[PDB]
Nucleic acid binder design. Sequence first.
RNA 1: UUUGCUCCACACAAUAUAGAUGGAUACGAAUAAGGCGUCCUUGUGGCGUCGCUGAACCAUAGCAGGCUAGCAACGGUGCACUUGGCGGAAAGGCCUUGGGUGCUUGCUGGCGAAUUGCAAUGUCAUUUUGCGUGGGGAUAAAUCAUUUGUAUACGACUUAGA
RNA 2: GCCCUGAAAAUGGAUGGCGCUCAAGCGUGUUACCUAUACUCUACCGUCAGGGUUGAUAUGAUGCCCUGACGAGUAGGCAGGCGUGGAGGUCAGUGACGAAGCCUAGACCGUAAGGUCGGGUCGAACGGCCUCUAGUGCAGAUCUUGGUGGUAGUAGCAAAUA
RNA 3: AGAACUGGCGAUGCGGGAUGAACCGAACGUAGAGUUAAGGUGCCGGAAUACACGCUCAUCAGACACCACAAAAGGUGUUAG
RNA 4: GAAAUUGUUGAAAGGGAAGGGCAUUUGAUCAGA
Lengths: 48, 127, 197, 106, 61, 172
Amino acid sequence: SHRKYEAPRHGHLGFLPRKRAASIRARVKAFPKDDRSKPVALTSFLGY
Amino acid sequence: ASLPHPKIVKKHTKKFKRHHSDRYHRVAENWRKQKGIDSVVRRRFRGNISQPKIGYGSNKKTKFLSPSGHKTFLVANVKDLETLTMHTKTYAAEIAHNISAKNRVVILARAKALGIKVTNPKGRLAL
Amino acid sequence: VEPVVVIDGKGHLVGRLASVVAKQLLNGQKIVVVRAEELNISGEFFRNKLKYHDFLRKATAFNKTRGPFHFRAPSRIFYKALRGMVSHKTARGKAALERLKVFEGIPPPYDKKKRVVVPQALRVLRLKPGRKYTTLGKLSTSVGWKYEDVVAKLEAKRKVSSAEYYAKKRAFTKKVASANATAAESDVAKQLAALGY
Amino acid sequence: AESHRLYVKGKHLSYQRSKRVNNPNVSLIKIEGVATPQDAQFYLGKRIAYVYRASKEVRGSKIRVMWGKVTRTHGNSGVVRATFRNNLPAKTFGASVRIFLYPSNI
Amino acid sequence: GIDHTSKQHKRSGHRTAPKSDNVYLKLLVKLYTFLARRTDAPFNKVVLKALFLSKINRPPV
Amino acid sequence: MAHFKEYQVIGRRLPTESVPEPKLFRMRIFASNEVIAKSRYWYFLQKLHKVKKASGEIVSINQINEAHPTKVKNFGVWVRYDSRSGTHNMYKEIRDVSRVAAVETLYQDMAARHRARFRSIHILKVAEIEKTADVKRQYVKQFLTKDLKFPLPHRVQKSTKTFSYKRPSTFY
RNA sequence: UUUGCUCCACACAAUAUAGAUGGAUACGAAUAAGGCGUCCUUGUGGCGUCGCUGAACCAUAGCAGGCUAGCAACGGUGCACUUGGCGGAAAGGCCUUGGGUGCUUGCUGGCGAAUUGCAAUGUCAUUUUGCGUGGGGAUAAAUCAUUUGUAUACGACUUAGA
RNA sequence: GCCCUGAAAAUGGAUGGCGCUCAAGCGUGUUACCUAUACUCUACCGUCAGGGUUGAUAUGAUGCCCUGACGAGUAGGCAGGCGUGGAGGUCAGUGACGAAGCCUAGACCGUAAGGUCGGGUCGAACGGCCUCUAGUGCAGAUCUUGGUGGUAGUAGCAAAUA
RNA sequence: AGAACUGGCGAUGCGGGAUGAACCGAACGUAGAGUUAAGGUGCCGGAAUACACGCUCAUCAGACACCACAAAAGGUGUUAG
RNA sequence: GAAAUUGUUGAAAGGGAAGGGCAUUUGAUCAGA
Ligand SMILES: [K+]
Ligand SMILES: [Mg+2]
Ligand SMILES: [Mg+2]
Ligand SMILES: [Mg+2]
Ligand SMILES: [Mg+2]
Ligand SMILES: [Mg+2]
Ligand SMILES: [Mg+2]
Ligand SMILES: [Mg+2]
Ligand SMILES: [Mg+2]
Ligand SMILES: [Mg+2]
Ligand SMILES: [Mg+2]
Ligand SMILES: [Mg+2]
Ligand SMILES: [Mg+2]
Ligand SMILES: [Mg+2]
Ligand SMILES: [Mg+2]
Ligand SMILES: [Mg+2]
Ligand SMILES: [Mg+2]
Ligand SMILES: [Mg+2]
Ligand SMILES: [Mg+2]
Ligand SMILES: [Mg+2]
Ligand SMILES: [Mg+2]
Ligand SMILES: [Mg+2]
Ligand SMILES: [Mg+2]
Ligand SMILES: [Mg+2]
Ligand SMILES: [Mg+2]
Ligand SMILES: [Mg+2]
Ligand SMILES: [Mg+2]
Ligand SMILES: [Mg+2]
Ligand SMILES: [Mg+2]
Ligand SMILES: [Mg+2]
Ligand SMILES: [Mg+2]
């Protein structure tokens, strides 16, 4: 039978699996769309 | 050489092994007929072991014949062996398992003298 | 009749092509299908999109990574049709499937090889004129295939190169045809014509 | 010449079978260039060899042969039935066979 | 399949030999078997049949 | 039932002492063979007159061949058929070179368009429409115009081989 | 490394084969339209022609293809060199220059073949591995242990240490 | 008629699946083709039935032979056989030169119950045939007794301050 | 849930209906060859992507009896009357 | 000095059991003539 009182689910299923990352340095999975009129520049940087 | 015979046809060469003798050690391979009410083997469902039946009976002309065309006759001594003196083409002597080595020598010598084929001449030979 | 048969999948009625190809692999023929993005399916694009969405909703409820995998690329859609028509869970079916390769576009191994068609699967020969049909590339893009633009670009490049190759071949063929037209009234040519050649 | 072949190529398709039971004692052979049973009648009775290779040399060769013959036509599309002295192994479904031109009636 | 109108493998239901192991009775049966086969005498046939009868089927006379 | 023949079937309603020489009724039956033809004769005769096969006899049965089998005719065909919910008379027109060919076409068309099986159809009449402009169906009239020509666009050639090397053409 | 590793050539041993037995022979697009040829006023052009399947095209003769003698022509083809160019979608292939060598069945001769006995796949392919003979090439790391806490139940992770 | 609206249910899913649109759909017609332990023919096994043959070298008339038909099976009936402990008879049977037992992806016979042989192990008895006899055949009974596993190097061996 | 007749299942495998006690076909000694039944012949899958005349386009098409459902009422959809 | 169960050695196979039937390939092994 139905849940008897509605409530949002706990947590975000889009951040699955809740596993350890494969590296200590997180991957950049997307860079800014290239605009080939601007001067050549890095799209990101590394820091601590 | 033995008496000429038709080609020996074995209708079912493979052993009729009891159902589930491959599954349980307590179930020996000696054939037993399933009597169970639901038995898939007794009911002869496709894909199951075949059961012994009289249709598998061998041609009476070739029944009991060894591949050499001789019927095996077990012999314990020379007198047993010479029971086959006039039947060398139909019977071959097989020396009994419990015959000692010296008696085997004597039986083999008599069989060679009489032209009687011996199925197991290499039993208990001098090493 | 060849060690490998390369089928140009363009306009080829995915189901009928899959039937032909499945029988070919099971009979032991190596098949390479190219231009799977240009395959056709009978019925409106909306119909086939709805069918693929019905496919998409099917998934193992307790773990979607166990469920049926919904491959988006046109080559993998065609492969799904072929696999569904091959007994793929047996070693024989596995061997048949290893006798198969399917590609979007015509990659470098096969762009310089002869492509054949399958008339019993050709859309223009099979479908009644006026019947609406879907193109696999459009359907695949709509359901999440990411490489329609890249495949189209590489296909345009290949077509430029292949048109240059064909211009050269046409010139050489005209030369050979002229040289055969000359010495066609020779005694040898008359004897050949008498024998049917 | 570059060609030495005196046999017609064929493919071992399957055993004789119904939907769910096969009969290994009969093989089905697709002969190259035969599209009708009328054409296959020519090849009825011809000897067929399945030629394969083994690691162990037996009687001066590492090539072994399974001999059979075409017995009758099968279906409408030129497939024939074949019987071999020993039935074909069924891993050879899709493997090549050689249908020789003998016994010749030409 | 055959639609049998009668029981299959039905024994005749008549004795073909005496149940007795009496060697002399068997000798009489052998003699009258020969006679019933090679004389066409209904007497010989009925005597052969009577030689097979059990004790209650041979009441004293 | 099959490729049809046409038979004349003449039956008698067997003579008695009171009524010798009974009235010799004849029918034209479309059937694939004489057995079906006689069965159909008795069916329709039982629909029309007090008779049955047990009380009557087939006096004759003769195949009627088309008088001019190689001339194209327009046929008016009156049929009576049972639908799923009633019985209906319909008139159709068929262009063909013989009555048997027209009747085969008619049975095919009835099965195709009204799902009427052979058992549900009675052929009331098949008649040649001698004068055009007595043809009253457009799907036949359109073939009776002067100098009728028409192309056959999109020709599909049946390949004898699995693979073709040509990317075929539908020109005609 | 009680002479290790890698590449090439050769030879010898194994190893198997989802199954060679002349050639997978490359436009693109349309199909109620096209292909090819040709011409011009270069086009959605004119004219001619083709399809109606690859039933094609190419190849194909020679002890499984030997040894030789010529003719004709400067063709065809194999090999290893070599000139240069193109090819990144999985390029790993395509094209091209020059000379050298072999073959050439385009044509005409001379010699050989047998006895595998009337057939027997009658062994001619390529896949990996090993070994030996030569030549060529290069001269590390990882883990355990110790250590860190950006990590951690244990493994794992992340650090440091000649 | 077909198609459509009417036409809403709970895990994701079923013309069996793929897929199929002048169908690989629906109605209808025609052929070819595929394949059951069914039908036809043949062999072999058995059963039943009808017969032939005691005229000899003939020891197996319960034998040999001829002819025809037939063969599903729970509960159940009957028949013919296989195996075990012991008993009378017999083979003047086997055996310390190795009985019995046991092990043996070694061989042979039987449709089968089983039988026989070889090899190893072993150490004192045992078997064939005709009969007699029964405390005579096990997969089960939450069977009985004994023995042994997987679980599993697992749960855990943490109260009473050290 | 309860009767009538017959045929079955139980007691029965085999080919077909994917699957299934009962449906269809057919009942069964061991084999060989031939031919079929019911059911099928795109591919899975043995067997015509056979031939023929039509019909149907469904943004929930339909796809063989038992059987695994759909109705009244409607539609210048389209077809034939 | 059996079996269950186990160690070692050798042989073989092994994509969510294993085992079985028919048939043949391959390896091993073997009788008969
Ligand atoms: K066991
Ligand atoms: Mg709620
Ligand atoms: Mg046996
Ligand atoms: Mg039961
Ligand atoms: Mg995604
Ligand atoms: Mg029978
Ligand atoms: Mg509906
Ligand atoms: Mg089908
Ligand atoms: Mg139809
Ligand atoms: Mg008798
Ligand atoms: Mg019985
Ligand atoms: Mg006792
Ligand atoms: Mg001993
Ligand atoms: Mg063992
Ligand atoms: Mg002692
Ligand atoms: Mg007891
Ligand atoms: Mg027990
Ligand atoms: Mg029990
Ligand atoms: Mg217990
Ligand atoms: Mg216990
Ligand atoms: Mg613990
Ligand atoms: Mg505790
Ligand atoms: Mg404490
Ligand atoms: Mg009961
Ligand atoms: Mg039944
Ligand atoms: Mg069903
Ligand atoms: Mg049979
Ligand atoms: Mg097939
Ligand atoms: Mg309605
Ligand atoms: Mg001890
Ligand atoms: Mg043990």
